[PDB]
Subunit: 181 residues, 4 copies
C-alpha cells in the first residue's frame, strides 16, 4: 500500500535521525568552528557533490551569500561540460579547486557513499592547496573517509540508504549555518 510505503519512509527518516543525533553533535560543532576560523581570516568555503548532493552544495552556498564567502562548484555548467568533455568527469571539481582555492580555505565535499570519484579528486586538490576538508558522507564513509587528515572533519551519517543520508546532510548544513551566525 502507498499509505504504508509513505508511512515507512517517515518512520525510517525518524530512526535515521535518532541514530545520527547521538554521534554527529560533536563533529558538527568542529565543522562549524573550522568554517568560522576560515571566514574570520578572510578565507572562503568551496562546496561540491553530485545529484541531490549537488543541490545541497548550492543550498548551503546560498545560505552563506544570502554576506559570507561561499561558492558552490556545481553551478557553472559551461565549466562542468567543458571539463567533462575534454579532461573527463573525474576532474570537474578538482580543476575548480585549483582555480579558486587558496591556503586556509575550506572544501565541503558531499558524497552519500563516500566514493564519488570527482569528490575524491577535489579533496586531493584541496590538500595540495593547504585547505581543510569537511566531508559529508554516508554508509561507512568510503574512500573519502580513509583519505582525510586529523585536521579535517568527517560527518558520516550511518545509514545505508541514500535518501536518508541526504536528509541528514541538509539538517547538518542547517545546524552548521545556525552555529556560524
Amino acid at each position: 500500500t502507498l499509505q504504508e510505503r509513505v508511512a515507512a519512509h517517515f518512520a525510517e527518516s525518524i530512526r535515521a535521525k535518532q541514530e545520527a543525533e547521538k554521534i554527529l553533535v560533536e563533529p558538527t560543532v568542529q565543522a562549524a568552528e573550522l568554517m568560522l576560523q576560515c571566514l574570520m581570516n578572510d578565507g572562503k568555503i568551496l562546496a561540491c557533490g553530485n545529484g541531490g548532493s549537488a543541490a545541497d552544495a548550492q543550498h548551503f552556498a546560498a545560505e552563506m551569500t544570502g554576506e559570507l564567502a561561499a561558492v558552490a562548484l556545481t553551478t557553472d555548467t559551461s565549466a562542468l561540460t567543458a571539463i567533462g568533455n575534454d579532461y573527463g568527469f573525474d576532474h570537474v571539481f578538482s580543476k575548480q579547486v585549483r582555480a579558486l582555492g587558496r591556503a586556509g580555505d575550506v572544501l565541503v565535499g558531499i558524497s552519500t557513499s563516500g566514493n564519488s570519484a570527482n569528490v575524491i579528486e577535489a579533496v586531493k586538490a584541496a590538500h595540495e592547496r593547504d585547505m581543510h576538508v569537511i566531508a559529508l558522507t554516508g554508509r561507512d564513509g568510503g574512500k573519502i573517509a580513509a583519505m582525510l587528515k586529523d585536521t579535517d572533519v568527517l560527518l558520516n551519517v550511518p545509514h545505508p540508504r541514500t535518501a536518508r543520508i541526504q536528509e541528514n546532510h541538509i539538517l547538518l548544513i542547517h545546524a552548521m549555518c545556525d552555529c556560524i551566525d
Copy 2:
C-alpha cells in the same frame, strides 16, 4: 553552547517529522497518484521554488530523469531567470516558463516554505490558466498558495514555523513521492 544548539536542531527536526507523519501520509499519496496519472497520459511535471526550494526543485527533477520520466526544473536556466527578472520583473520568472512548456494535463510542483512567494503564486495562476494541476509544497499555514488551490490540486503543508524544518520535510516528501512512482 554550540553542542546544545546542534543537539536542539536534531531534536526539533525529529519532532517536526513526528508531527508531519500524523497529517501528511494521505496527501502525499494523492500527490503521487496525481503524478502517476499525468505521466501515464504522456504528460510532464514542472517544478519550481526559491532558495533552498530551488535546490529542492532540481533535486526532484534529477531523480525523475535519472526508465526516464518527464520532469523539468524551472529554476536552472540562468539565461531565462535573469532575462525575465531584468526585463519583465522577478515575479514572472516561473510563470513565463509555465506558459512556454506547460500543456493541458501536466503538473506544476510549486515549492514555497511560507506559501506567499510571489513568483510561485504567479506560476500557480499560469498553471491553472493552461488546465494544469498543482502540487503545492508549503509551510506554516500554507499562505496565499493554499488559499488559491482547486479541489483537483493537492496541498502538502508542513505544519511548522521554521523554514529550515520545512525544507527538511519537503525533501522527505519528495523522496516518498518518487518511491511511490517507482513502485508502479
Copy 3:
C-alpha cells in the same frame, strides 16, 4: 603585440563570417522552417552542447521562452548533469534527458564545434530513436555528427578550423533562426 593580436581576432572573425555568408543562408532557412513546423504542431526544441556551446544552448532557449515558445536547454540542471556523469558516465548526460523529455516530432539542436562530442553524438542517437528531427551546429568538417544525419535533419557547419570563430558564427546562426521564427 597585444594591439596586433586583438586586431587579428577581429579580422579573422570578419573573414570567417564572410565565408559562412556564402554557404549557410539556405541551410539556416531550412533549420528555422523545421523549428516552425515543430512548434506549430505543439512540439518542443531541446538544445545541448559543451563549454561555450552549453552557454549557446541556454542562450537559444532563453530567447525562445522570453509569446512564449517551447524550448528547453539540457545543459542547465546540475543535479541531472552530475548524477548522470557520476552514476552512468559523462557521455549519457544529454541522451538521458532526451529519453526523459523528447517526443515524436520534437527537435534536438546539438551544438559541437568539432562534430565529435561524445555526449552530443549519444544525444543524436536518442533523438533518432524517439523519431525527433535534428539540427546540428558543427565546425571544421562536421565530424562524426555530420556523417550521422538523416535526410530530414539540417546540418549547419561552420567551415573554419578555430573553435573561437566557430562559436561566434554559431551565435549569429542562432540569432538569425530566432528572428526568422519571430517573423512568423
Copy 4:
C-alpha cells in the same frame, strides 16, 4: 523572405564588427592588461550579466578555469532566487560581490544597453570594495558608462541591435582570453 532576412543578418553582423574593429582594439588591450595585473597579484575575476550576457559571463569564466581564478555570479540559481525573492532582483549580483570580492579583484559587468539595474549595483559594490571594472556595453554605454572611473575600462560596442552587441562581446571575450594566454 527568410533567405533575405538571414542574408541581412550576416551582412549586418559583418558591418557591426567592421565598425567595432576600429575603436575597440586599444580598450580591449587595456582590459586584458588589467586582468593580468589582477591575476598575477593572486586576485580573481568576477563576471555577471542578464539573458545572453549571463551566458557570456558563464562562457568567459569556463575558459579561465579550464587554471585561472574566475567566477560567474550568474550560475547559482538558489542564490539568485533567494535574493530576488527576499531582497529584490536589483541586488542579486551586488550581494555576491560583497560576499566574494576583495580589494584588487576585477568585476566584468556585461549589459547590452548599459542600463541593467543589477549590473549597476554590482559596479557600485565593486567600487566600495576597491575592485576595478570592465564594462561590456552597447549603444551609448548607458548609466554604467557614466559611472566608471579612470582605473576602470569601458568596452562599448556602438550599435543599436542587441544581437549584434552580444556577438561582438563574445569576440571581445575571446580576444581578452587569448591576450592573457599569450603573456603567461
